[PDB]
Amino acid sequence: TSAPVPPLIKEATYIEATASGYMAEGVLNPTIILRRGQRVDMTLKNKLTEPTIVHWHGFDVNWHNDAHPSFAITPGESYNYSFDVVNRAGTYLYHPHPHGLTAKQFYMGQLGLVIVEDSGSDLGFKYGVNDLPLVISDRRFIGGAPVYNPTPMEMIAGFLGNAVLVNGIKDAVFKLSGGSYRLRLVNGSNARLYMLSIVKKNGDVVPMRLIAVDQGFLARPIEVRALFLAPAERAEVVVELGEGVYLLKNTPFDHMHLEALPEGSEYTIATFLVEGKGEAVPVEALPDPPPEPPKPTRTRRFALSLSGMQWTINGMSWNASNPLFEHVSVEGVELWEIVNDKASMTHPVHLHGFPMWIIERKDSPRQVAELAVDNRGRLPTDLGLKDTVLIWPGETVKIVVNFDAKKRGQLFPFHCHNLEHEDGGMMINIAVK
Amino acid sequence: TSAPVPPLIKEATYIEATASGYMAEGVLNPTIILRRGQRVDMTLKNKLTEPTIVHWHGFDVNWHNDAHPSFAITPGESYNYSFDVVNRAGTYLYHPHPHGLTAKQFYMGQLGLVIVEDSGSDLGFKYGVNDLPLVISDRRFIGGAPVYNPTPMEMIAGFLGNAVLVNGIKDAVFKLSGGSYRLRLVNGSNARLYMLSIVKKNGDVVPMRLIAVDQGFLARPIEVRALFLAPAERAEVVVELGEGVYLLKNTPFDHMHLQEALPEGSEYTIATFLVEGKGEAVPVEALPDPPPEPPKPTRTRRFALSLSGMQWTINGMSWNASNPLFEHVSVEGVELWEIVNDKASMTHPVHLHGFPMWIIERKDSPRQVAELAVDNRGRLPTDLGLKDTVLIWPGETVKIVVNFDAKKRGQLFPFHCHNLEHEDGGMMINIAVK
Ligand SMILES: [Cl-]
Ligand SMILES: [Cu+2]
Ligand SMILES: [Cu+2]
Ligand SMILES: [Cu+2]
Ligand SMILES: [Cu+2]
Ligand SMILES: [Cu+2]
Ligand SMILES: [Cu+2]
Ligand SMILES: [Cu+2]
C-alpha cells in the first residue's frame, strides 16, 4: 500500500525559504504539527534572491507574527516568530507573502501544511495511514519542467496549468486497504478552482461526510456529493472505501471567466486502488462545535471590480509605496456584505487575523445554489468557521467578523487568494481601531 | 583613479546560469573578449529552478547557437555552443532568452558583455583604463533589495525602476585622469529609454564623437550632443575630458507612453566623473573596417506594431507558446522592411536575430527625434552604422534592409521588441528563411 503525503515535523524551529520550497530542519515542505495552546518559536531565514515573509494562513496572531507583508526580510536576513497557538484543531497553511512576489514563490514550491491538534481531534485516524492530506495544485509543464510565465492577460484572470498534482505528484495514485479514510482536501493552486467529487469506476458517486473546514470542525458531519474548493480553502471529508477503484475527479461546471485544461471541464485528479481489508474508524461525535456568530453592530459593503487593468476592493488596491496605508478602519463585530460584479470572475477572498462566520449567499449561480443546505443559500463548507470564502460573479456573501480590541493598532490584509490577483494589487489593509 | 567596469575573461569555456547572473569560470557576468574569426566553444549549465537559454545578442550564428528560445534547457541540463565568430569588431551582449521568463532572469543579474576585437579595433585604448564600458540599467529597490514585481499594467508598458545603475553601481562615480576616453554606452535596462548627454558642472554640453554602434564602426566619427539609447542598443563614443567635474545625464524628452518614481523623460544624473590630473591623449580619426554598403532590396515587406487589447502584436501576430517553431513570416533574399509603429502606441526597441540591418530612412519622426537627424532621410547618427536593435517611435516609420543569406535557410530567427516586458508578453515572431 502507498499513500504519498507530505512528511511530518513536530513543531518547527528553523525554516529556510529556498527557491524550491521551505527547508524546515532538513526536510522539504513538511507538515508542521502543533498542539493547541503551545508556544511556537520558529526562525525564518531568507535563502532567496528577493524579499519574502511567511504567512501563517488562518492563525489568530498579532500582525508581527502574521506576518504583515511590510515585515518582509531581504536576502540573507532572518525573522523570528514567537506566538501562542490559539486556533481550533484544523488544517492551516504557511506560504510566502511579499507583495508582488508571492505568486511565483508559492507556485515554485514554497507551500506547506500546518495541523493543529486538540483533544481527540484525530478522531481515531493516523497521519499517512488513513489521515491523508490531499494538496491539489496545478502546474504548467514545458519540457517536463514547471514554469511560471504569466502573460498580462493571465495576470488578470489567473495562472492555470496544464496538469493537476496531489502533493506534488502528477496523475497521483493511492494504493490503500479498504476502510475509513479522512481526506484533508487542500487547494494549493494559484488560481484554479475545483468542484471535487469522488466517483466509483462505474460512475457511482461516493458520498463524502464533511467534518471540518478552514478554521476547524463543524457542529456535525454533513454528507456532500461535490464541493467547490477555491485556492487556500480546506475541507476535511471522511469516505468509506471498499475494495475497488475510485477516482477523485473535477466534475463539470461553468467557470464564469473573462485553455489546455479547462477549469470547468471533467478530469481525474487522483486514482484510488483499494484492495484488502483495512481498519474501520467510527465517526459521529465531533470534538468541538464552532461558536455561534456574534451579533454584528455595523454593516459594511465591499465591491469587487476590475477597474481597467487593476482588481479593486471598493475601488482600492494595494499601495506599494506605503504598505502601512490604512484602507479600511474597523472596530467590534461587523457584518460584511461582499458583492462581486457580474462583469467579474470568481474571487476566493481571505481575511487575516480574524475568522469569519458565513451568514448568507444570495444571487449565487444555479450550480452553486443547487448545493446549498439551508434557506440562506449556505453551502456545507459555509456551516463551519472559515477564513477563505469563494464569491461568484454577481453573488453577495455576508460574513460576520469580530474585530477584537486586543489587536487594535494593527494592520491585517484583506485580499483575494487568486495569487495573480493579489500580486496585481487586489489587497487592502484592515486597520483595527 | 577608479573606473568600475565588469571584469574580463579572454574567451569563455564554461558559463553557469545562476539566479544572480552568469558565473563564467568563477567571475560574475564578465566581459568576454573574442577575436574575429576564432572558434567559440562554450558550455552553458542551467543552475536555475526554471528553464533558460543563452542568446548571443547580435551574433551571426545558426539558430542552434543563436540560440532559438525553443532550445531552452531544463534545470540541471547543459548546452554546448560551437560557432565561428564572423561579427565585426563591436560590443555585443549575452543574456537569457527563454520565452516568458527572460525579463526576470535578465533583470535579476543574467547579463554580460561580449567584445569582438579585430585588427586595430582598440584604437589605442585599454580596457578598464580609458576604454570603459558603461552598462546603464535601472532597478526598483524596496528596502535596499532589487525586486521585479510588475503589475498587469507594467507588463504592458515596461518595468521602470526608481534608481539607475552603471555597471551595477547606484549613483556611480568615475575618478579619472584628464585625457581621451572611449565610452561604450550599453543600455542594460528592461524597458527604460535614455537620452544620454555629457555636461560639465556649469552646464556646457560636452560633444561626443560616435565611432561604433551595435554591429561595428561607422565610416567616420560623428559628433553628437545627445543620443537616444534604447534597451540593448550600443553606442561607442569618444570624449575629451579635462580636469573638472562631468555628469552623464538623462536629458529631458517626451516619453510617449500609454510607477512614475523616476519619470523616463525627466532629467537626472546617471554617472559622475571626477577628472583630476593629466593622463593620456589618444588621437582618433581613422576608424578600422568601414561598414558595408546596403544591398539592393528585391521585395518590400511591411510591419505594423500595435497593442491588440492586452497583447502587443507584430503584424497582428504574437508568439505562439504552444508551437515555438511556428513560422510567422517566411522570407527570402534581400528585403526592405517598412516597420511602422501606431500613433496609439509607445517606443519599441525592435530587434532581429541572425542578420544585421541597414537603416535606410526615418519618416514621421517626432520633433525631438527629427531635430537630431544628420541627413535628408531623417537618419540619426546611430542609424549611419550597421545595427541590430533600432528604436521606433509612435507614428514613426523606419525602413531597413536585410539580406536573408542562403547560408541560414531552413532556420528560424526571432524578431521581437527588446522591451523585456513586451517580449515576455509575446511580442515576438519567428522569421523563417526558405
Ligand atoms: Cl455589473
Ligand atoms: Cu494564504
Ligand atoms: Cu480574485
Ligand atoms: Cu494572505
Ligand atoms: Cu538581446
Ligand atoms: Cu539578438
Ligand atoms: Cu516593445
Ligand atoms: Cu532576442
Author numbering:
A (entry chain A): 38 to 295, 303 to 477
B (entry chain B): 38 to 295, 302 to 477
What does the study report here?
Multicopper oxidases (MCOs) are proteins composed of three Greek key β-barrel cupredoxin domains (domains 1, 2, and 3) that come together to form three spectroscopically different Cu sites: type 1 (T1), type 2 (T2) and the binuclear type 3 (T3). MCOs couple the one-electron oxidation of substrates at the T1CU with the four-electron reduction of molecular oxygen to water at the T2/T3 trinuclear copper (TNC). The substrates of MCOs vary from organic compounds to metal ions such as Fe(II), Mn(II), and Cu(I) and the family is generally divided into two classes, metalloxidases and laccases. In this study, we engineered the hyperthermophilic metallo-oxidase Pyrobaculum aerophilum McoP to enhance its activity for aromatics, resembling laccase activity, using directed evolution (DE).
The hit variant 1B5 of the fifth generation contained 12 mutations; to reduce to the smallest subset of mutations, the last round of evolution was performed with DNA-shuffling of genes coding for wild-type and 1B5. A library of variants (~ 4200 clones) was screened for ABTS activity, and variant 3F3, with only six mutations, was selected for further studies. The 3F3 variant selected after DNA shuffling showed a ~ tenfold higher kcat than the 1B5 and a remarkable 2-order of magnitude higher kcat/Km compared to wild-type. The analysis of the X-ray crystal structure reveals four proximal mutations close to the T1Cu active site. In McoP, a 23-residue loop 288TPFDHMHLEMGHGMQEALPEGSE310 and a short α-helix (188–195) are occluding the T1Cu. The overall average B-factor value of 3F3 (49 Å2) is higher than the wild-type enzyme (32 Å2), and the loop 288–310 in the 3F3 is the region that shows higher flexibility, with B-factor values ranging from 43–69 Å2 (vs. 22–58 Å2). Part of this loop (segment 296EMGHGMQ302) is not even visible in the electron density maps and was modeled with AlphaFold2 applying a local energy minimization using Yasara. The observed increase in flexibility of the loop in the 3F3 variant may be attributed to structural rearrangements resulting from mutations in the loop, such as P292H, as well as mutations close to the T1CU site, like P390T. The increased flexibility of the loop 288–310 in 3F3 caused structural alterations at the entrance of the tunnel: it is more polar than in the wild-type and has a larger diameter access entry (4.0 Å vs. 2.8 Å) due to the shorter distance between H294 and H292 (3 Å vs. 5 Å). In 3F3, W355, which is located at a distance of 3.4 Å from H465, exhibits significantly greater exposure to the solvent than in the wild-type.
